[PDB]
Amino acid sequence: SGFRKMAFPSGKVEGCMVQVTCGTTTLNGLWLDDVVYCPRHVICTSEDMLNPNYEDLLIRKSNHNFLVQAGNVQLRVIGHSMQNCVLKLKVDTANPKTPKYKFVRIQPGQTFSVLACYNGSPSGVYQCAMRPNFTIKGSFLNGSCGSVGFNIDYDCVSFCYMHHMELPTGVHAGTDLEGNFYGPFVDRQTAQAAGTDTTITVNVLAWLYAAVINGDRWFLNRFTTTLNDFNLVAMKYNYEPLTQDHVDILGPLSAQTGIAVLDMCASLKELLQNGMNGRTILGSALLEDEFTPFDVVRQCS
Amino acid sequence: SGFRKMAFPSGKVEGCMVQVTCGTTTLNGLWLDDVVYCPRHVICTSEDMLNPNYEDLLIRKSNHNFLVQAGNVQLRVIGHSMQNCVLKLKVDTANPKTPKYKFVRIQPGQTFSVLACYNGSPSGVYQCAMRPNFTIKGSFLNGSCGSVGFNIDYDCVSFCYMHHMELPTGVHAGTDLEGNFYGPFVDRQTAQAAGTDTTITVNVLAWLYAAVINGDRWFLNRFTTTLNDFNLVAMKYNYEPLTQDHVDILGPLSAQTGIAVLDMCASLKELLQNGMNGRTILGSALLEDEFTPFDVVRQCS
Ligand SMILES: *[C@H](N)[C@H](C[C@@H]1CCN[C@@H]1O)NC(=O)[C@H](CC(C)C)NC(=O)c1ccc(-c2ccc(F)nc2)cc1
Numbered sequence: 001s002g003f004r005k006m007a008f009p010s011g012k013v014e015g016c017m018v019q020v021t022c023g024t025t026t027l028n029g030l031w032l033d034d035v036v037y038c039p040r041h042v043i044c045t046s047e048d049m050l051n052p053n054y055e056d057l058l059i060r061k062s063n064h065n066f067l068v069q070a071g072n073v074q075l076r077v078i079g080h081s082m083q084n085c086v087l088k089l090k091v092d093t094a095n096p097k098t099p100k101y102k103f104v105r106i107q108p109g110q111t112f113s114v115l116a117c118y119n120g121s122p123s124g125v126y127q128c129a130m131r132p133n134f135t136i137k138g139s140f141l142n143g144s145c146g147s148v149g150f151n152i153d154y155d156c157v158s159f160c161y162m163h164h165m166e167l168p169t170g171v172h173a174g175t176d177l178e179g180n181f182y183g184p185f186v187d188r189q190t191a192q193a194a195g196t197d198t199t200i201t202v203n204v205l206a207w208l209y210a211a212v213i214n215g216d217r218w219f220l221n222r223f224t225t226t227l228n229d230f231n232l233v234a235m236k237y238n239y240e241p242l243t244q245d246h247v248d249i250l251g252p253l254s255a256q257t258g259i260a261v262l263d264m265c266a267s268l269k270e271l272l273q274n275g276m277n278g279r280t281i282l283g284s285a286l287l288e289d290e291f292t293p294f295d296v297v298r299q300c301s
Numbered sequence: 302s303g304f305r306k307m308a309f310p311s312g313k314v315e316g317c318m319v320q321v322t323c324g325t326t327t328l329n330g331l332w333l334d335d336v337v338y339c340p341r342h343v344i345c346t347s348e349d350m351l352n353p354n355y356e357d358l359l360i361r362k363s364n365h366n367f368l369v370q371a372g373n374v375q376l377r378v379i380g381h382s383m384q385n386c387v388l389k390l391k392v393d394t395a396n397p398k399t400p401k402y403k404f405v406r407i408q409p410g411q412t413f414s415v416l417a418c419y420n421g422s423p424s425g426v427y428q429c430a431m432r433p434n435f436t437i438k439g440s441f442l443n444g445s446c447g448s449v450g451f452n453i454d455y456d457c458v459s460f461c462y463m464h465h466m467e468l469p470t471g472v473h474a475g476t477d478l479e480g481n482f483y484g485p486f487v488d489r490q491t492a493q494a495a496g497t498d499t500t501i502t503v504n505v506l507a508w509l510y511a512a513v514i515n516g517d518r519w520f521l522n523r524f525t526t527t528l529n530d531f532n533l534v535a536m537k538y539n540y541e542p543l544t545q546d547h548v549d550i551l552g553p554l555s556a557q558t559g560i561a562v563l564d565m566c567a568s569l570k571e572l573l574q575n576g577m578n579g580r581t582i583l584g585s586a587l588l589e590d591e592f593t594p595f596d597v598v599r600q601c602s
Pocket residue numbers: 027041049140141142143144145146163164165166167168172186187188189190191192302
């Protein structure tokens with residue numbers, strides 16, 4: 001029935017996006033109850049950026065220096081404070097569209113949806129994975145900072161990412177909603193190198209299950225394997241080690257398709273050492289690792 | 302700054318999704334002002350499906366046989382009628398969240414976002430292109446029918462697609478919001494073959510501009526070409542003919558990047574006859590034709 005990379009419905013998060021202006025710098029903020037969250041570099045001039053002293057810059061600002069707009073409505077700021085790399089502005093109006101929400105810090109290998117925003121207004125939505133080196137492959141222009149990443153379950157929005165910067169390789173870096181960066185990055189305009197990345201093995205396996213469910217079965221073989229024999233083969237191709245917890249996380253997909261997790265591991269072992277030899281899987285000539293086991297189950301059920 | 306396939310923010314459309322139940326069949330409907338739109342096969346039993354007489358089935362239904370629910374709220378149906386392949390149910394309550402909207406019929410080669418829904422509730426969002434053979438490559442399960450496709454400009458939602466069926470090849474077929482199918486398909490449970498498809502040439506060129514904007518420039522060459530010489534080369538690879546209107550539609554992207562449209566055509570001519578030779582473009586080993594010129598401009602600006 002078709003497998004696509006697909007984002008969460010964004011309407012709950014659209015209702016929380018606001019514009020935050022301090023001086024001549026404008027970016028996005030997240031308005032939940034009576035607090036707006038945004039990146040702290042909203043308080044920099046274009047000349048403070050090479051190496052800012054954020055605490056020093058902030059002590060010169062008062063509440064009125066922060067212009068917050070929800071659509072065509074100004075929100076009066078009545079308090080402000082800095083939490084790691086994010087700013088918290090208290091406002092005199094609670095957001096009447098606040099969803100049920102949590103702040104979470106995700107693990108490498110997990111995915112989320114990004115609502116890309118400019119001037120407090122949404123531009124589009126797309127899915128991203130936290131790489132093992134704590135970068136994401138996004139699409140962000142000037143003024144996108146403060147756009148957020150999130151998951152939904154039933155009715156609860158778990159925010160996990162806030163955008164801060166681009167790296168020289170073209171990938172993106174940001175913080176959780178407590179303002180702590182993912183990875184070893186800082187919010188200043190200096191060249192910063194991303195770690196050496198790795199392939200997310202358990203996600204590749206999830207994607208092979210998605211392929212079988214949707215008509216691509218040519219790579220299945222008659223073999224099984226042990227977890228130890230698989231990892232000895234895969235480590236040469238810069239795949240992260242497959243743990244017993246990963247096998248267990250794949251368990252529900254094995255039960256849905258009738259293909260044992262270690263049977264699929266044997267198919268992946270064969271694809272690594274032999275290649276694809278002119279064939280594709282779900283239209284791709286490369287193995288894809290940006291879908292989690294839960295992403296596949298959510299889409300296929 | 303990164304190029305991604307990206308969907309429109311879905312919140313305006315989420316506010317219009319409702320569940321429509323007739324007998325034991327349930328699917329999705331679109332609630333705008335005081336009318337719900339949905340696929341007419343909501344009125345079939347599981348046994349009517351091989352070749353339904355929809356007009357006959359409908360004359361046996363009255364208003365009360367249609368259960369419409371917006372969340373946990375029933376909407377009382379006060380009228381009903383069939384327009385080609387869609388049903389229109391008048392309800393006694395206007396949708397207080399109706400956006401500014403239009404119904405449009407899109408052309409092959411254009412794109413839109415799909416909000417995939419089950420039981421009136423959104424599951425996810427993704428981008429699709431109307432193929433030259435009037436199919437889309439979607440992701441739809443049982444009960445997804447009545448999910449809609451759409452574009453936004455500023456504040457206006459242009460609905461262009463409503464989902465009805467899957468074809469034996471795995472691709473999807475549906476109607477505009479007046480109930481007219483795209484392509485030569487009918488809404489019955491019978492095997493139906495999609496036409497022979499073609500590559501959307503003007504979209505491939507748009508995607509090459511997106512590649513250059515985002516760091517992939519190895520395929521640019523020093524040559525120009527004429528529209529006629531390009532088409533003589535491309536027609537052997539099942540690319541649709543490039544028209545002067547297509548060159549003009551690409552004009553704004555040429556002005557943004559400094560690369561003349563016919564210069565980019567010369568690069569595409571070289572890629573067709575020589576291949577990619579182990580290199581990729583925006584991570585892909587194949588040329589992609591599912592982004593329009595406007596999709597690239599919207600994302601890159
Ligand atoms: C938020 N509005 C914005 C989003 C950026 C803009 C371009 N694409 C990004 O996603 N954030 C910023 O511009 C950052 C502000 C600092 C954190 C204060 N800066 C950067 O994103 C950035 C920093 C450094 C470089 C760079 C330095 C040296 C070098 F050789 N190459 C790159 C680039 C970008």
